[PDB]
């Protein structure tokens, strides 16, 4: 596919259709200008690491169908996608830095030992998976003939986080292979051995449009801390520090759950900075509190349904000084630092 | 006019005054940096197709006075503007890709057969028009001595859509020439022969700040569909599909009127993508519905006062399968696809 | 410090820690791409006048601690900062165009006669100040042994305007030297001789989030002009024009106080354009009023607590035609144009 | 034609054949990289004023057939070429800044009043010429039915200056139209009226490979000035100054004929600088003489067969102080400054 | 001076005249395009570290008059030039990275403690020098009232190395100040104390056009090594290794004098690579010998008149193992490594 042909589809199909046709173009810097109706117009601006003309082609051939949020594929260490390409609207670029059977200019020659992502919706996908060494196979339907584990009921659809697709709930089932064997998932136990049940998933919310998803979260959003801490006997769980956050010093104390930041945002403006942005289970922001002048260079925030978080803490028999607890979130074991006082998610 | 002199006016006059003076500059990539008070500052960022230094000059000499929204000049196929230059704040660049008597670097040598835009507010404008082969002449006042047609009562003022200028209503009158003859406008009939009255104009609204402009639109915004469809006996007009839109499938059904998208936006987040952006009567978005996961790659939306739209449909004696109806909007004949079921504006 | 090491700190410390470590990078245009977890990500986009790799280093070593808003350092004509670097989040770049003891690539060799900024929080700062010819020394604590003047109780903290730092009020004391002498500040008089008390400071508010800070301002925001003008016998002060602004003509009349623009914004959309953006006591916008179509290319706005403004006008014995009054704001003498009718802040 | 298709022809045909096929590409800055045999290679570097992708297309579609040297088309003021494009290997870019029926991105819409170049070798060329207002028509054969004037017997063939094409002498005949009339060439008279016979043509030689073309030139190259000046009684013609050049002062005296510079180059290294480079009858160099340290910022050199030059001077009845003589060279009237002492070609 | 005005002078004066006039321009990347005669032409290509528009201005205002070769000003550690700017045609950029009273965009504010270069040919130059702390003052004439030292009889004239200027020998006299005192030069002694007479100067020759300058050098160029080594009883001076160079191993042995490289070039092709190029007394090349396959990554070459070199070695009472000798060349003390075997110029 040529540049003019790519630029043609982007403009007439909304992505790569494979339809015939050309449109006059000009690549100026990161700008891709299309001459349309004799008037020049910028149709794509390049913020990927690829050459502009190439970059517009990847973007033009991005998945326009729903798929598991990329943080999950990050946690699974996907090296490349088989016959398709994912776009990180958070990253404002392509997901994997490599392509396969997608773009002549970037497609790798060998992906043998790489950890490959196969979408059951692509023809040949499943046959490819069954023969690969390392990879993840996904399907919107549970295959009885594949050992599989179900993911959260939400997905990335053109960068939007949806929980339904045509009012039908989002469903995804994962199958995995490593060193040429099929990882056998079973109903119980922990996904990863010591170094949990692999059932916890981040909520995927934006501070700009946060929303409570349980009667408890709602109670967090509308009840004074003391009141709320009482209703759920969170008494001895340092929630004040860890989830509400303290703004009396120069360094913000705690503030590790997203919902906490949302609650703050209600009375005080919270300016978040993030130099490394893309879908990830745990974020690392540079927070500054407008009303107190308090702040923190590196403050990790994770968006867990408050309910889930409260249990994680209850399951903790916090009677040990500096204990390093492992919490499996989004199919991965993340470790949390736990002094009988603060409980924070480490910069793993 | 030199770069330093342009950069001087931009900074002291707010556009090109023609006043004398220089300011030290540096053109770095698309950036134009002015050394002001010994401190370097970016005063212009280039997203046009021209060389940065040139681009800042065009922008500096942009029309700071009101004028007809560019989609209208698009519909009239204006090739270039006579002695002035228009800026598309939607496009974030210059309107026509060519200039005339404006910028030494870009001004064309011959615009004889081109379709020229003459503003009666420019000296020599009218004399130039009367001698051109193809062009449009505009004036805020109706000239008794020119055959003219009145445009909508709104205008582009620095990219803002206004309906008054000093609390005085916006008024524009168009005169047109083709193959050296004056197009003679008359009170009745259709602007274009079969292939209507040329009195329909898009509303120019932003989904971000939509606003009802008739008691009917308001009723659309606040009454349940069923209720509303009843009050106006829209019974047999498929409004459900076409104007409210259906989100039960994977592909959004209908959703072709802007006000419809606004109404949705009330309960569900609608993420619109548009690769080709500039003022145009009909837009083509890549819509995705956040609450249902429904979406459509190419979904054309036009912003017609709902009232006008309801008549367009009533005038339709929809008793014919696949009929292709022509609707003259913004001085141009756009064709709409009409099955006894869906009525959509084609990607003309 | 190397690029990889800078890019490492930015990502792990949130700024320059001086910690060891490298991260693979790629400088593409103004983009700085970090290869993280085998996935390429843009961590910095260059809009400064420096070479991209250099620019990320300055930004990485920006002051993450509170400091006086830059307009104040602008008014004091600071040429360079001693051993530290300030970032203008408004400018989206570095403050001074020069560096000193901060970046090998940009640090000047001699800053002898330059006007230097010394922060008492930097080791060696005060000793350096006491020996410089021209410079300003600042400290969060009032030094009994230095002649000093107190600044406003607010500060730039990572670009956010705070009035507390750990719920403790912001405090800054300035010491100044010129031609090798210490400027001796005294309790009374005017900071600058004729060409006032040097106690007036702009409020630092954003039209996007304006907020009344006195019962008077609140009354301006909620009482009809006539009503309000009465409650404070502003009768003969042309407030209508100057502070409320007139929108009946093509050229906006008056409109020189920020709070005035905020009040407007309540019923009419005010689109502000500003080609030269950075923290400055007086701004120069290109305003356009959406509801009236009125506008002005160059319209200077200053954000003074309305209370302070009302006195400035009262102190004026406006009984003289074209009198040019000097008003000392933010440690600097700005001149205002005053006809018995309009009172505007000049484009000094 | 797409980028990949252009890049394909350049690589397989050596220019634009119109053959089908694509090659993977990447446009990085002014570089055009082709992925060939899985190895990336730069096939074109952009030093034109167009966007890189566009620039390679023009170059790919350059005239690979012989044609009159561009200085001649410069002297005739050609604005654009009809259905073909010329490449200035001196300029290292395209000739005219505009194209017509050659490149969708750059082809002008109207060339009506422009001065057009029609090549009789292009189909439709002659019919187009006969209908244009202003233009030049060329043909390798003398058309009995067109008023025509013959040009020099040499041509630009891929940037090389040839005098034969398949051992057959180069031949070109020019036909011209202005204000819709055919310029009628006759055997005698002067091409341009006072403000000569239009038979003088520059020799097209490179100082790097200069070569005598008459027994006289050879005698200039091998006989001492005095000797040579005698053999041709050039006694009273200031040849010393004007053609041999004087190097005793700080400013080179004379030195206006190319052959003169070549002769010098024999014993002293002459470093020529030229900021505006392309085929032009008269050059303007910044000469510096290595052996004497003499030099001149602006020193105009023209390459006339010494024989022709000697007559031009003889025809001059130099008995007048400051007389400004017109000399028609390469179909154009260039004026020469003539004091009874120095005779130099002006920077017309 | 504006861009258009700079571009105008470059084109009509050959450098900056200060004459009035503009030329349309376009800055594309490092390219500066001038629209001349309606045809776009590149007049300057930017390989300096400055922004293109700025870079063309410096180049346009370069010294077109003779001056001491830059390596000498390098050896004197000149930080900036007073009221003028030097161009390194070797470097293909500006000499000092800073300017003073030359370019608004780059001129430093304070050069007080910097080491300044004052040219006696600039008005005010000498008065400026007499008041500076650290600097060098130069004059083509020996001032009886200034302590001065004479430099070599050759100069950089537009990048060409000349020994005459209008057949008059090149002459330069240096005056120097440090810590506010005038360095007092006397007839005898060593310029620098231990850590010689300051009368040795490199020859400034190009391997491409090397030329013997003494009957001895000529004898080196035409006599077999053995023969030559005999005629000058160079017997015990390892000249074989050090000056002729050995090519029998993989690492070239010796080869530190330029004339040696020239002699080689006679029978074997010597490919020199140099990553850091500009006028410097000692070069560091990456040499590879075509006929023997021998080579050396870092091989320092200095161009001394062979005669001078032979004495330097004779003055050496080489009877000491690893002695580090200091040799003052081009006004600077460079140290040479000297084992009773090899004598090489260190990478100081």
């Amino acid at each position: 596919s040529s540049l003019e042909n790519v630029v043609y589809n982007l403009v007439n199909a909304g992505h790569f259709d494979g339809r015939a046709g050309e449109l006059p173009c000009a690549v100026i810097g990161e700008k891709v200008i299309a001459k349309i109706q004799n008037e020049d117009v910028v149709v794509f601006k390049n913020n990927t690491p690829f050459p502009t003309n190439v970059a517009v082609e990847l973007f033009a051939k991005r998945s326009i169908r729903p798929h598991p949020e990329l943080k999950l594929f990050r946690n699974l260490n996907i090296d490349v996608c088989w016959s398709h390409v994912l776009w990180d609207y958070a990253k404002d670029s392509v997901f994997c830095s490599s392509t396969y059977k997608v773009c002549k200019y970037t497609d790798l020659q060998c992906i043998e030992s790489l950890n490959v992502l196969f979408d059951g919706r692509d023809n040949g996908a499943l046959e490819a998976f069954k023969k690969c060494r390392n990879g993840v196979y996904i399907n919107t339907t549970k295959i009885k003939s594949l050992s599989m584990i179900k993911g959260p009921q939400r997905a990335d659809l053109n960068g939007v986080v949806v929980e339904k697709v045509g009012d039908s709930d989002v469903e995804f089932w994962f199958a995995v292979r490593k060193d040429g064997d099929d990882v056998i998932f079973s109903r119980t136990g922990s996904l990863e051995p010591s170094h949990a049940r692999g059932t916890i998933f981040t909520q995927s919310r934006l501070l700009s449009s946060f929303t409570p998803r349980s009667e408890m979260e709602k109670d967090f959003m509308d009840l004074d801390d003391d009141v709320f801490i009482a209703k759920y006997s969170l008494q001895d769980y340092a929630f004040e520090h860890v989830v509400y956050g303290s703004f009396n010093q120069k360094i913000i104390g705690g503030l590790h759950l997203l919902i906490g930041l949302a609650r703050r945002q209600q009375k005080s403006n919270l300016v978040i900075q993030e130099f490394v942005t893309y879908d990830s289970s745990i974020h690392s922001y540079f927070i500054t509190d407008e009303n107190s002048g308090s702040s923190k260079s590196v403050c990790t925030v994770i968006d867990l349904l408050l309910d889930d978080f409260v249990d994680i803490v209850k399951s903790l028999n916090l009677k040990c000084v500096s204990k390093v607890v492992n919490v499996n979130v989004d199919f991965k074991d993340f470790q949390f630092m736990l002094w009988c006082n603060e409980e924070k998610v480490m910069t793993f």
Side-chain angles (χ1 to χ4, degrees), chain A residues 190-194 196-205:
Chain A
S190 81
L191 281 183
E192 295 176 43
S194 57
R197 316 190 329 179
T199 61
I200 285 71
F201 296 112
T202 44
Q203 290 309 304
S204 315
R205 287 172 291 184

Side-chain angles (χ1 to χ4, degrees), chain A residues 324-340:
Chain A
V324 49
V325 47
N326 285 292
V327 190
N328 187 279
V329 187
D330 301 334
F331 294 150
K332 183 186 166 80
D333 266 50
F334 298 84
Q335 60 194 203
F336 285 54
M337 188 57 72
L338 162 67
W339 309 82
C340 59

Side-chain angles (χ1 to χ4, degrees), chain A residues 201-299:
Chain A
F201 296 112
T202 44
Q203 290 309 304
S204 315
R205 287 172 291 184
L206 295 173
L207 213 302
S208 45
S209 57
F210 197 84
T211 291
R213 291 174 180 177
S214 68
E215 164 179 335
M216 181 183 85
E217 290 203 321
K218 180 197 69 182
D219 284 320
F220 185 78
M221 297 293 110
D222 310 318
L223 299 185
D224 300 339
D225 55 305
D226 63 304
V227 175
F228 172 95
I229 300 181
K231 188 198 202 78
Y232 307 86
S233 295
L234 295 179
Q235 321 310 316
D236 52 302
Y237 285 150
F239 256 49
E240 279 300 323
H241 182 75
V242 174
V243 189
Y244 282 101
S246 49
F247 302 101
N248 291 185
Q249 320 78 222
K250 285 171 57 181
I251 306 78
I252 292 164
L255 198 65
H256 303 298
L257 246 83
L258 189 71
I259 206 192
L261 285 67
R263 188 164 179 286
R264 178 61 173 181
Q265 200 83 251
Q266 277 174 160
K267 58 165 293 179
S268 169
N269 172 51
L270 264 189
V271 184
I272 289 67
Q273 312 181 67
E274 171 158 47
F275 315 120
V276 179
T277 51
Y278 56 42
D279 192 51
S280 75
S281 295
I282 279 76
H283 287 85
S284 179
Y285 305 138
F286 199 111
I287 297 166
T288 305
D289 188 66
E290 176 183 272
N291 289 18
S292 66
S294 177
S295 67
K296 210 198 292 190
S297 326
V298 182
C299 171

Side-chain angles (χ1 to χ4, degrees), chain A residues 43-56:
Chain A
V43 300
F44 175 75
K45 212 189 300 288
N46 179 38
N47 276 100
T48 63
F50 309 98
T52 305
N53 69 299
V54 170
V56 64

